[PDB]
Scaffold this active site. Structure first.
Site, PDB file in Angstrom:
ATOM      1  N   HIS A 153       0.612  -0.958  -0.065  1.00  0.00           N
ATOM      2  CA  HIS A 153       0.199  -0.097   0.184  1.00  0.00           C
ATOM      3  C   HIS A 153       0.753   1.054   0.130  1.00  0.00           C
ATOM      4  O   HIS A 153       2.387   1.253   0.287  1.00  0.00           O
ATOM      5  CB  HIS A 153      -1.200  -0.178   1.042  1.00  0.00           C
ATOM      6  CG  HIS A 153      -1.342  -1.211   1.692  1.00  0.00           C
ATOM      7  ND1 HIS A 153      -1.108  -1.513   3.005  1.00  0.00           N
ATOM      8  CD2 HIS A 153      -2.552  -1.821   1.266  1.00  0.00           C
ATOM      9  CE1 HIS A 153      -2.149  -2.462   2.762  1.00  0.00           C
ATOM     10  NE2 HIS A 153      -2.887  -2.898   2.411  1.00  0.00           N
TER      11      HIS A 153
ATOM     12  N   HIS B 269       1.381   4.395   1.947  1.00  0.00           N
ATOM     13  CA  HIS B 269       0.572   5.394   3.518  1.00  0.00           C
ATOM     14  C   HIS B 269       1.063   6.730   3.333  1.00  0.00           C
ATOM     15  O   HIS B 269       1.786   7.446   2.444  1.00  0.00           O
ATOM     16  CB  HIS B 269       1.514   4.446   4.015  1.00  0.00           C
ATOM     17  CG  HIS B 269       1.157   3.214   4.754  1.00  0.00           C
ATOM     18  ND1 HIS B 269       1.040   2.831   5.505  1.00  0.00           N
ATOM     19  CD2 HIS B 269       0.852   2.696   3.696  1.00  0.00           C
ATOM     20  CE1 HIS B 269      -0.310   1.588   6.268  1.00  0.00           C
ATOM     21  NE2 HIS B 269       0.859   1.715   4.754  1.00  0.00           N
TER      22      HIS B 269
ATOM     23  N   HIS C  19      -3.062   4.205   5.630  1.00  0.00           N
ATOM     24  CA  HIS C  19      -3.562   4.432   3.850  1.00  0.00           C
ATOM     25  C   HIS C  19      -3.089   5.564   4.009  1.00  0.00           C
ATOM     26  O   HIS C  19      -3.943   7.075   3.771  1.00  0.00           O
ATOM     27  CB  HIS C  19      -4.246   3.872   3.403  1.00  0.00           C
ATOM     28  CG  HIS C  19      -3.522   2.589   3.906  1.00  0.00           C
ATOM     29  ND1 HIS C  19      -4.306   1.489   3.509  1.00  0.00           N
ATOM     30  CD2 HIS C  19      -3.319   2.066   4.445  1.00  0.00           C
ATOM     31  CE1 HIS C  19      -4.135  -0.219   3.522  1.00  0.00           C
ATOM     32  NE2 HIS C  19      -3.069  -0.116   4.906  1.00  0.00           N
TER      33      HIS C  19
ATOM     34  N   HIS D 100     -11.208   2.313   2.684  1.00  0.00           N
ATOM     35  CA  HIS D 100     -10.186   0.736   1.888  1.00  0.00           C
ATOM     36  C   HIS D 100     -11.302  -0.385   1.350  1.00  0.00           C
ATOM     37  O   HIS D 100     -12.436  -0.566   2.027  1.00  0.00           O
ATOM     38  CB  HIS D 100      -9.070  -0.133   3.681  1.00  0.00           C
ATOM     39  CG  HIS D 100      -8.554  -0.626   2.494  1.00  0.00           C
ATOM     40  ND1 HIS D 100      -7.003   0.068   2.421  1.00  0.00           N
ATOM     41  CD2 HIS D 100      -8.742  -1.782   2.735  1.00  0.00           C
ATOM     42  CE1 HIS D 100      -6.054  -1.763   2.063  1.00  0.00           C
ATOM     43  NE2 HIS D 100      -7.320  -2.742   2.421  1.00  0.00           N
TER      44      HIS D 100
ATOM     45  N   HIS E 156      -8.491   3.307  -1.573  1.00  0.00           N
ATOM     46  CA  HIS E 156      -7.289   4.183  -1.758  1.00  0.00           C
ATOM     47  C   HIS E 156      -6.505   4.174  -2.963  1.00  0.00           C
ATOM     48  O   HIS E 156      -6.425   3.408  -3.519  1.00  0.00           O
ATOM     49  CB  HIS E 156      -6.419   4.292  -0.709  1.00  0.00           C
ATOM     50  CG  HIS E 156      -7.187   3.815   1.064  1.00  0.00           C
ATOM     51  ND1 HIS E 156      -7.100   3.000   2.087  1.00  0.00           N
ATOM     52  CD2 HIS E 156      -7.927   4.422   1.208  1.00  0.00           C
ATOM     53  CE1 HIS E 156      -7.644   3.281   3.168  1.00  0.00           C
ATOM     54  NE2 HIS E 156      -8.442   4.380   2.613  1.00  0.00           N
TER      55      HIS E 156
ATOM     56  N   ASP F 216      -3.595   1.672  -2.669  1.00  0.00           N
ATOM     57  CA  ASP F 216      -4.723   0.272  -2.007  1.00  0.00           C
ATOM     58  C   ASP F 216      -4.063  -1.053  -3.384  1.00  0.00           C
ATOM     59  O   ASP F 216      -4.299  -0.826  -4.370  1.00  0.00           O
ATOM     60  CB  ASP F 216      -5.841  -0.338  -1.899  1.00  0.00           C
ATOM     61  CG  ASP F 216      -6.407   0.761  -0.565  1.00  0.00           C
ATOM     62  OD1 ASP F 216      -5.447   1.008   0.316  1.00  0.00           O
ATOM     63  OD2 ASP F 216      -7.554   0.416  -0.546  1.00  0.00           O
TER      64      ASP F 216
ATOM     65  N   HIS G 132       3.849  -5.532   3.696  1.00  0.00           N
ATOM     66  CA  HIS G 132       2.787  -6.281   4.424  1.00  0.00           C
ATOM     67  C   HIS G 132       3.417  -8.013   4.292  1.00  0.00           C
ATOM     68  O   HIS G 132       3.705  -8.080   3.919  1.00  0.00           O
ATOM     69  CB  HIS G 132       2.154  -6.247   5.016  1.00  0.00           C
ATOM     70  CG  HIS G 132       1.249  -4.611   4.884  1.00  0.00           C
ATOM     71  ND1 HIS G 132       1.163  -4.029   6.493  1.00  0.00           N
ATOM     72  CD2 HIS G 132       1.175  -3.860   4.590  1.00  0.00           C
ATOM     73  CE1 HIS G 132       0.826  -2.507   6.107  1.00  0.00           C
ATOM     74  NE2 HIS G 132       0.556  -2.226   4.760  1.00  0.00           N
TER      75      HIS G 132
ATOM     76  N   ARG H 216       4.305  -4.194   8.719  1.00  0.00           N
ATOM     77  CA  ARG H 216       4.736  -4.111   8.432  1.00  0.00           C
ATOM     78  C   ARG H 216       6.196  -4.096   8.467  1.00  0.00           C
ATOM     79  O   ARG H 216       7.119  -3.458   9.257  1.00  0.00           O
ATOM     80  CB  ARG H 216       4.757  -1.666   8.344  1.00  0.00           C
ATOM     81  CG  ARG H 216       3.190  -1.698   8.369  1.00  0.00           C
ATOM     82  CD  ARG H 216       3.476   0.364   9.278  1.00  0.00           C
ATOM     83  NE  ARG H 216       1.945   0.262   9.529  1.00  0.00           N
ATOM     84  CZ  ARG H 216       1.627   1.354   8.946  1.00  0.00           C
ATOM     85  NH1 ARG H 216       2.481   2.516   9.262  1.00  0.00           N
ATOM     86  NH2 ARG H 216       1.038   1.971   9.916  1.00  0.00           N
TER      87      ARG H 216
END
Ligand SMILES: [Cu+2]
Ligand SMILES: [Cu+2]
Ligand SMILES: [Zn+2]
Ligand SMILES: [Zn+2]
Lengths: 168, 166
Positions: B58, B60, B75, B83, B86, B89, B125, B148
């Site tokens: 993603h 951030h 995000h 979500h 986004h 995303d 992630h 993360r």
């Protein structure tokens, strides 16, 4: 409110030799409004402690491209096509004492906003002193003879926290 | 004029010693300021067992690595949508034998304009994005994608990386 904040986690270049120092730290930026001059904070460590002091150049380079470490960041960011040290990210020299650098600066020419934003570009820390365009070669008027690129980072958008906490 | 950006994915500064070390590159290309974004993802370092896995990536909000990936915020959500709508995303990616390699066309992120991802963070992630179907509040904020592992600040770059890395 309209205030802009950015940060840059200075890390040693991927292309360094074992003999070179490994410089780490932070550069913070704060711009009160788009037309405002830029404020910055620089705190680095990892310089040689012998000699006990030195002068080192820090600038903004064109590309936030760390694929070849600091080498891939390109030349000084130069959107108005002028000689060094007229580039907006020509921050000048910084005094290193006992291996560390710690300095606020104000009245910088660079911006976090607008067509000439340095967001997404690179801050580069050099091995040498910037001659500010006064040396007797072409490099003087390109990069100030500041020498080898020790450490760099990509300038990132950030919240107000880092600047507030550092100021205390 | 085409815009290009690069993001040099590196392990989080704040990982513990037992976490995997994911490194690689995400490249971006936008043909015009309002075109959809094209992206290339090439990462290595994932655990090699289970041989296959699916991992979320993603954008951030903050290009702030002061606390590694932890300081990059939530995000990026400039258009105020849940979500997984986004702009950054990017969804789940197939990891096979420790590696990830994928081209995605037509992403609803931008390198231009008030909603640019330039100077923000790409975060990789440990887990799979539940794509808003996890049945809890977090699911429609971040997709419950686990810790993360690796991240970078999105940088402005020249055409060269995109031409060579493909
Ligand atoms: Cu420089
Ligand atoms: Cu994420
Ligand atoms: Zn310069
Ligand atoms: Zn999201």
């Amino acid at each position: 409110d309209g205030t802009l904040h950015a940060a840059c986690q200075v890390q040693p270049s991927a292309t360094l030799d074992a003999a070179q120092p490994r410089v780490t730290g932070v550069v913070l930026f704060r711009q009160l409004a788009p037309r405002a001059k830029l404020d910055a904070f620089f705190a680095l460590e990892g310089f040689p402690t012998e000699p006990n002091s030195s002068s080192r150049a820090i600038h903004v380079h064109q590309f936030g491209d760390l694929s070849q470490g600091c080498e891939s960041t390109g030349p000084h960011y130069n959107p108005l096509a002028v000689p060094h040290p007229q580039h907006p990210g020509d921050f000048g020299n910084f005094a290193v004492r006992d291996g560390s650098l710690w300095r606020y600066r104000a009245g910088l020419a660079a911006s976090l906003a607008g067509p000439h934003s340095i967001v997404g570009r690179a801050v580069v820390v050099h091995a040498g002193e910037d001659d500010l365009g006064r040396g007797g070669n072409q490099a003087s008027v390109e990069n100030g003879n500041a020498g080898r690129r020790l450490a760099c980072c990509v300038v990132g958008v950030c919240g107000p926290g880092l600047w507030e906490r550092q100021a205390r």
